[model samples]
Target: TKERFVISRRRTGFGDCLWSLASAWSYAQRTGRTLVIDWRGSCYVEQPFSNAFPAFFEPVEDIAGVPVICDDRVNQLSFPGPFFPRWWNRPSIDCINRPDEQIFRERDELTELFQAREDSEANTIVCDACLMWRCSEEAERLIFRNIKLRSEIRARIDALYEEHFSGHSIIGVHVRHWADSELALHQVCMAIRKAKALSYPKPVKVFLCTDSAQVLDQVSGLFPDVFAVPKAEMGIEGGASALIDMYLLARCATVIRFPPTSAFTRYARLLVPRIIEFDLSNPGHLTMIDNP
Candidate 1:
């Protein structure tokens, strides 16, 4: 039998893409197949990373010595993108107020095609997913062992962490304030004030992660010393930067995620599984959750 491979597509948010890669990576590993990450037309990459896995991290060598990689040619012949389509229906916000249902014929067909490719004797299998609900120690280990940042980006991340995170008990706050539930900026600040009080003379630091510059500015003001990863929105805005932000969150001793369901903080927890977590959307209480 020929050396087989798994090609995972990068799509949507970084959190989603990360898990998508994880899902495929696990599959590839289980089947003794090589994993090739395809980021060609992802939301994060307008100028695609030729072979994203190697560019972002060290390459995984196969027993075969030669490596399979991602490029336009590889993608063209790869299987269809979306992972298990049965759960594709993303009901809008109003669904809570009113009842409704959706039928996903395209998802049905896409998943059908995926099944065909998944089972075939073909050498390649392609997948895209965001499975936050699915937790795997093996996937986490795979990510930690592999998926390392390139030296340049790793250097930048290390510098930032050294500057802001050394010696301090860092409290990570992810403000997903775009109607997933509008968590007030100052409210988050107030919560941080008390959350830090839990540290009690340990001198806690805050690590704020947000897509909105305005939110960052709002929280930055309330706290005398708050650290957020510098993002170049108008210039370089994508994977490297986002990945940098994630590692910083992982570095935190505790993480606060508003709305609780955001995949960003969820996946970052894999890096620091013991980190304390609070759901900021839970009214005024800074209640901690289990196994976060």
Candidate 2:
């Protein structure tokens, strides 16, 4: 029997990898191929994401019984160690001579092209795309429904919530200094102030999830009531910490985001689809849920 394969090797921030994997997984479903996800490292950390990824999610062993694999075992190809885009390593006609720095100018055009040229003789497809962002309803539901946090991460989250957020109102703030070129801390403060005013005189728990120690520094300093799991165990790129923060934020009734258009908080919004979001990115439009 011919074994069809779709390899997703896109590596970046945890959020980007998640989006890329979803797109790759969706493509595999559409093309009837086994999907393989291998994100060994990122810009900030050289550790294998195979470890960090499975450290949280229960893991994707199969999708629609089509078979999905994650880890180094399925990644039999000698695609060089952690680096930026372009899988010129794979022996695909589309990428044979293409420079490693080259990227698809058109979105999913190469994706569809790859699907159209599927040869049973070459039963493997290597692609890195985020087509799911702009599209998909059934795929989104199926994928999100299938995603389950590993018990280890879940237990930690439960303990934390039980400790700090069990009986309190929560305002989740995701400030991504690692990726954002510029962000004003005052904007975040204002959002928090506005959010808190809604529940004036009522104590609210502020859960801060950030990639920068400085942001946390100022936030915690100014608002000493802020809470976050210790970053001591979090790797440079935030391995399990990122996952924990995401799920933790999912528990909140509302979230304040620095860069309004980020996949990090958006991923949290997945769990609480209707959770109110306060966008500090657009200071002028810092309104609640109905802003957009």
Candidate 3:
């Protein structure tokens, strides 16, 4: 625990948190280190993680950085709420310090706990490391831990995909801009059609994941045969399967209509080199989109 490691937020929404937690636990298992000083609010809901304190230091909890996705109509419902109480906090130390321009006098004291660098160059950011705790040591500890964790997550995700998809070819669709109704509807239709067009002989099922489930339901009957996953409640604390759902997309033959600079979409790119990314973020936009 002397190294005082800091984790990066997955840049995406819910999905990033799960991946980070799993990977972080894997790292801990391999290195015999505990990642106690998390900067981001995301963390595991289960045991060990629940009872843990940094072996050498205490953690900082802040929820200001996690992303929120909502429709224009639902914008009023959104508030900078608590993501996790112990792990991520809406009114965290980081938030208060930055907003009031308050300097931390206990810098050296805090550094000793996290074991991070006490100098100017050290990065003291927080994020979810729930998974880092699960790592098991071996000669190939880091590599194996990462691969095994990803493989296990991938297996679980594939099971979910099979439940809806059966044997049909599947297209993964991610719509980020929940605020746009017209663009959201148009993109869904286009993705379904495009997936069909690309692999005509096979039937296509579009697994649409987004925050605009109501909007999606409005046009639900339009694609009678296309199968899509029901949208989960967003911004809720704890759950690895929700995060694994995003990882499963990486295994798809192609990814459709992902946001241009999204961490969730980036995960797909890392897993599948042949991914087809599209900026069909605008729901009303009629043009067919694809990215290599």
Candidate 4:
């Protein structure tokens, strides 16, 4: 049936899945094969694929009676290189328990399944560079446009935008402080303040998104005009909150992200083509979105 399967066994989370999917999408594009996502390994966070993303991929449960296995070895082989040129780095064959050649060979007549094992490797490059670098202009636009937030999540985003950032320009700040460190919080706040000042026409307010309540409180205290949805108000826990944060970050006019991060910022940048992105790692450098 010529359908290909993408099993993401390494790096299981919302951010990890997004990065893996970007490469998988590249594989699908190059191979002319529909992908069947093997999402069993994403146990660090349990997120249903449909709930995580809008309708953009076509994954079949079964095709031509071909059986799919939850194997992680497929990601280490170099034979699958032909399926992934848009990958961040040139695909390399890993000798560690490399799959039998017949696995790829068997893909000729029936559905073929492949997995990516690199742990969050080239995630930033895949999202920011490779997808656009590899796909045609029209194809890139079509692909990005198709990856919209689902209706419920989009509704939450729309309400947040209407309530806090509709007419006013906002600088979105993502603080991923797993530990409560005042120094890191100060660095992020300084970056946010600098970004707001250097921002064109000036941002009216700052929208703070963080997993740590301590960091959020400290930042909000630093900036009296900051806005954040209280954790109590969100009513959801774990990965859903992460998804909501990503969407909210995408809604802002400009986003200032903290480092040692998740794929949320990268995906948010992809969602908002015209957004201005600043990394606290290098606050001096600003990457402006030039896509349509």
Model 4 worst lDDT run, 10 consecutive residues: 121-130
User: Please, what are the lDDT tens digits per residue for candidate 1 over residues 63-95?
Assistant: 233244544555455343332332322343532
Give the lDDT of residue 87 in candidate 4: 30
In candidate 3, residue 223 scores what lDDT?
A: 66
Instruction: Give per-residue CA lDDT, model 4, range 29-116, as digits (tens).
Output: 5444434334432343243332223221232233223232323323443222223223323334442333445333323211222233
Instruction: Please tell me which predicted candidate would have the highest lDDT against the true structure.
Output: 2
Ranking by TM-score: 2, 1, 4, 3
**Tens digits of lDDT, candidate 3, 214-250:** 6457545676554454432232222444456566666
Model 1: CA > 4 A from native? 48-55, 62-123, 178-183, 200-202, 231-237, 273-285, 290-292
Alpha-carbon TM-score of each model against the true structure: 0.71, 0.75, 0.50, 0.59
Worst 10 residues of 3 by lDDT: 48-57
Error in Å for residue 120 of model 2: 11
What shift in Å separates residue 53 of candidate 4 from its native position after superposition? Answer: 7.0
- Model 3 vs. true fold: TM: 0.50
Who wins the TM-score comparison? 2
The residue-by-residue lDDT of candidate 2 on 209-279, one tens digit each, is 88778878888998757988884234542656777887788777677766666777766656542334444
